[PDB]
Design a protein around this motif. Sequence first.
Motif, PDB file in Angstrom:
ATOM      1  N   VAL A 193      47.066  -0.353  23.295  1.00  0.00           N
ATOM      2  CA  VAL A 193      47.486   0.362  24.497  1.00  0.00           C
ATOM      3  C   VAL A 193      46.658  -0.079  25.694  1.00  0.00           C
ATOM      4  N   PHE A 194      45.338  -0.196  25.514  1.00  0.00           N
ATOM      5  CA  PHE A 194      44.480  -0.592  26.625  1.00  0.00           C
ATOM      6  C   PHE A 194      44.736  -2.035  27.028  1.00  0.00           C
ATOM      7  N   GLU A 226      54.600   6.491  23.946  1.00  0.00           N
ATOM      8  CA  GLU A 226      55.918   6.805  23.425  1.00  0.00           C
ATOM      9  C   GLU A 226      56.737   5.554  23.144  1.00  0.00           C
ATOM     10  N   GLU A 227      56.238   4.380  23.530  1.00  0.00           N
ATOM     11  CA  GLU A 227      56.970   3.127  23.419  1.00  0.00           C
ATOM     12  C   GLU A 227      56.374   2.268  22.311  1.00  0.00           C
ATOM     13  N   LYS A 228      57.238   1.819  21.396  1.00  0.00           N
ATOM     14  CA  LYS A 228      56.802   1.047  20.236  1.00  0.00           C
ATOM     15  C   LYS A 228      56.067  -0.227  20.629  1.00  0.00           C
ATOM     16  N   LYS A 229      56.441  -0.846  21.752  1.00  0.00           N
ATOM     17  CA  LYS A 229      55.847  -2.125  22.121  1.00  0.00           C
ATOM     18  C   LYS A 229      54.344  -2.032  22.341  1.00  0.00           C
ATOM     19  N   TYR A 230      53.799  -0.831  22.533  1.00  0.00           N
ATOM     20  CA  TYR A 230      52.374  -0.661  22.776  1.00  0.00           C
ATOM     21  C   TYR A 230      51.618  -0.126  21.570  1.00  0.00           C
ATOM     22  N   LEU A 231      52.296   0.143  20.453  1.00  0.00           N
ATOM     23  CA  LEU A 231      51.691   0.840  19.327  1.00  0.00           C
ATOM     24  C   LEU A 231      51.352  -0.081  18.161  1.00  0.00           C
ATOM     25  N   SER A 237      56.018   8.569  16.328  1.00  0.00           N
ATOM     26  CA  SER A 237      55.881   9.914  15.782  1.00  0.00           C
ATOM     27  C   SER A 237      54.561  10.131  15.051  1.00  0.00           C
ATOM     28  N   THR A 238      53.762   9.085  14.856  1.00  0.00           N
ATOM     29  CA  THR A 238      52.507   9.185  14.125  1.00  0.00           C
ATOM     30  C   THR A 238      51.288   9.172  15.036  1.00  0.00           C
ATOM     31  N   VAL A 239      51.467   9.086  16.354  1.00  0.00           N
ATOM     32  CA  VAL A 239      50.345   8.951  17.276  1.00  0.00           C
ATOM     33  C   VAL A 239      50.361  10.079  18.300  1.00  0.00           C
TER      34      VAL A 239
END
Length: 434
Positions: A193-194, A226-231, A237-239
């Motif tokens: 994310v950062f 909320e966006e998969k591209k950053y996870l 739903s797990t973060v």
Amino acid sequence: MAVTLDKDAYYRRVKRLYSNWRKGEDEYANVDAIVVSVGVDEEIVYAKSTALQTWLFGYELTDTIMVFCDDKIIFMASKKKVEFLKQIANTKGNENANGAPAITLLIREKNESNKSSFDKMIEAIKESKNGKKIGVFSKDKFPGEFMKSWNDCLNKEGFDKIDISAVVAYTIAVKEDGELNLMKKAASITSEVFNKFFKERVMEIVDADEKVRHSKLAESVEKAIEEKKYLAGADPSTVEMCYPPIIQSGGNYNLKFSVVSDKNHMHFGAITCAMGIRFKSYCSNLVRTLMVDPSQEVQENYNFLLQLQEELLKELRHGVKICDVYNAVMDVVKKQKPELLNKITKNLGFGMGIEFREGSLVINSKNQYKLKKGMVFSINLGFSDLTNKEGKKPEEKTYALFIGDTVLVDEDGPATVLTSVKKKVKNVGIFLKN
């Protein structure tokens, strides 16, 4: 479709709880029963009562009472929660349950009175060893009529109460391999994310000369998870955030994690950025300071801060007292930059797990607890109230430097960094060139 409870994990960890309790060190001494009650969880604050449920069951349970006695355990909750706990109460034929006290489940009644169930738990405490002293998490006070009726009943017995928060925190501090994998992923998501959103957004703001309030930037970081591209492959739903992201700048700093971002427009100088992802209930933490066109003096202080963190990592190893790690770091400051002694954060980090910040595992001058391999810490160091000699406006006069990583305690020797965000000046400087 029903929620699955990791049975082997429960049996393993409840036995570990009883083995530490049985050892009887510190506040565990002379404790006849452990009583944990969760009412309605308004949240807002992390709590030992619900953290213990996460550790034992994998899930928190509101309006639930847990009484651990010498030779038996009683859980009282709604019918839905009792059905859930039957997964561990009904031993079936699992020999992993051999070492654990038998569980009795009591069903809570919304109406028709609970006096019969309360009395069973009180009698169980009375029959447990001396039946006089109970271990509690005295800080945990939850609202609700059900909790009020239980604590009113419990208080009529006049048990001696001892807070066992610290000994329990130490009991669960060392992470299992499965727990470490969760914290490693949490730390990797925070880094993604950062690296992919947070830092890029700040650089875009500076490059465009935009006026953005710290609160708005924090909201954008919250939206980003909320966006998969950053996870980094994890499902949204797990973060969740460990706390609302904290951005500070322009002479208005407070190097801690219990404040929110203010409404001021971000100043293009020293921008402290703190965020942490909680992945499947396990926390991580990261702090980076982004410096716009940093002068020689700023770079020298920042690189000294990196040097201090490196020394901390070297000393943060199995068997060492926490206060000895603290003194080792402060000795470098005294020896090399005495003028920064009154500028450095009084705390240098804290134990981190299901709960974001273990108050009994803070790296300070007082903490006598010894580190153990398998513990995970947020290691944070900062300098506040530093002066820019070339500053002319108040928001340019003073700056701060703050760095933070998630690390795993090892044995012989240096701790392992679990976050992955480069922090050399060339990686955290926001330069005219871009």
